[PDB]
Amino acid sequence: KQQNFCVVELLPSDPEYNTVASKFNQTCSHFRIEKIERIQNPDLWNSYQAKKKTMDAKNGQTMNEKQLFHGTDAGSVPHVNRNGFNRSKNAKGTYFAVNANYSANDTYSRPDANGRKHVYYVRVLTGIYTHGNHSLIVPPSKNPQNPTDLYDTVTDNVHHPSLFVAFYDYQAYPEYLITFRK
Amino acid sequence: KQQNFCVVELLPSDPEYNTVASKFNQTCSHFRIEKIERIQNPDLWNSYQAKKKTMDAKNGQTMNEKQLFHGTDAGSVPHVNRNGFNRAGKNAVGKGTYFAVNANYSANDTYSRPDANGRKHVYYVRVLTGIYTHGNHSLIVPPSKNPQNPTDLYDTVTDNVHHPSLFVAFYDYQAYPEYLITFRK
Ligand SMILES: NC(=O)c1ccc(Oc2cccc(C(=O)N3CCC(c4ccc(F)cc4)CC3)c2)cc1
Ligand SMILES: NC(=O)c1ccc(Oc2cccc(C(=O)N3CCC(c4ccc(F)cc4)CC3)c2)cc1
């Protein structure tokens, strides 16, 4: 699939704009939001909703999907817009933050030559997660009897998570991109 | 206008792909092209074709439009895709935008700066060069053609009026960033 995409800027009067800016300003009010855009990539979306359908049929009552933040540099934006976060420079999976302020750190959302920072608000299939360590390239197996079944994501803390690490293709859809500055 | 846009990657078999890769490799054969994309921004396009329509009505037989190269950094790409080269004055200065006849001027690391992954970005741009004169890297607007009539200024300035290698444009909607070439060394 070609995974072409369109970039739709949301109006400040839009309900989606206020929803996204609201979650971001929970921890990043001190920044100036320049624009919020929706990434419309039908192929990437279909692939994501397909893997969500499979997970929704496997985790029973689990609310598999969460909306999390991902800071990246300006160079990565056209590449995330097209390919999602597939087959990755993270921190060998992809890191997502519960709160925007982790992603607004200059190390991740590096200011570009014009001083602009980029943080995505991502639909992520966190699924069933366990505690991780920054040295896993695949998630651990749920059952030592059945190394078949691995966890979907890993986290820093299973009961009050602040970060999740995803490892599989089409596990995240970069729905909104926030461009801001200090 | 919102000036939203879509980014369509051309297939290596497309007639457009090899047309564009052909113009680029005239002077940049040593690079590897990773992908060629078409920027589809209807609002920016309509605005551009309107300003081409007026210029086509003013310069008689002049072939107003040329296809030129512009290297930029990865940070600028989402901004050019939406806004074109409209309104630091952070070009090769100066209130204008620099376009190269040949891609190798734009492929210089100073303009198409390699990003963290080593990728370089050069647009193949539709530019209304129009009627141009010689420039002197110190212009905020192009000079007026006639001192009798300071109304009508030139459309662009150039390094060489008869063998141009570079153009500077100063007005809004004078350039459309039709194709984006992503490549590496
Ligand atoms: N791009 C982003 O927006 C982004 C979003 C979230 C994000 O999480 C952070 C935030 C701050 C520091 C770190 C950090 O390096 N470690 C955290 C503590 C340790 C650890 C915890 C959990 C693990 F599973 C593995 C290791 C060591 C590594 C990670 C990073 C980037
Ligand atoms: N972004 C780009 O892809 C890009 C495309 C083309 C481009 O042209 C170049 C290439 C090499 C040097 C220069 C340069 O600084 N001057 C050129 C020589 C002099 C000059 C002559 C005529 C003029 F009207 C103005 C100035 C002094 C300044 C500019 C730069 C960037």
UniProtKB/Swiss-Prot annotation, chain B:
The domain of life for this entry's organism is: Eukaryota
Modifications made to the protein after synthesis: Auto-ADP-ribosylated.
Q: What induces it?
A: Up-regulated by IFNG in macrophages. Down-regulated by IL4 in macrophages.
Transmembrane annotation, as ranges: none
All copies of domain PARP catalytic, residue ranges: 1-185
Subunit structure of this entry?
Interacts with STAT6. Interacts with PARP10. Interacts with PARP9 in IFNG-stimulated macrophages; the interaction prevents PARP14-mediated STAT1 and STAT6 ADP-riboslylation.
Identify its protein family.
Belongs to the ARTD/PARP family.
**Name of the protein in its database record:** Protein mono-ADP-ribosyltransferase PARP14
Q: Which organism is it from?
A: Homo sapiens
Residues shown, of full length: 1613 to 1801 of 1801
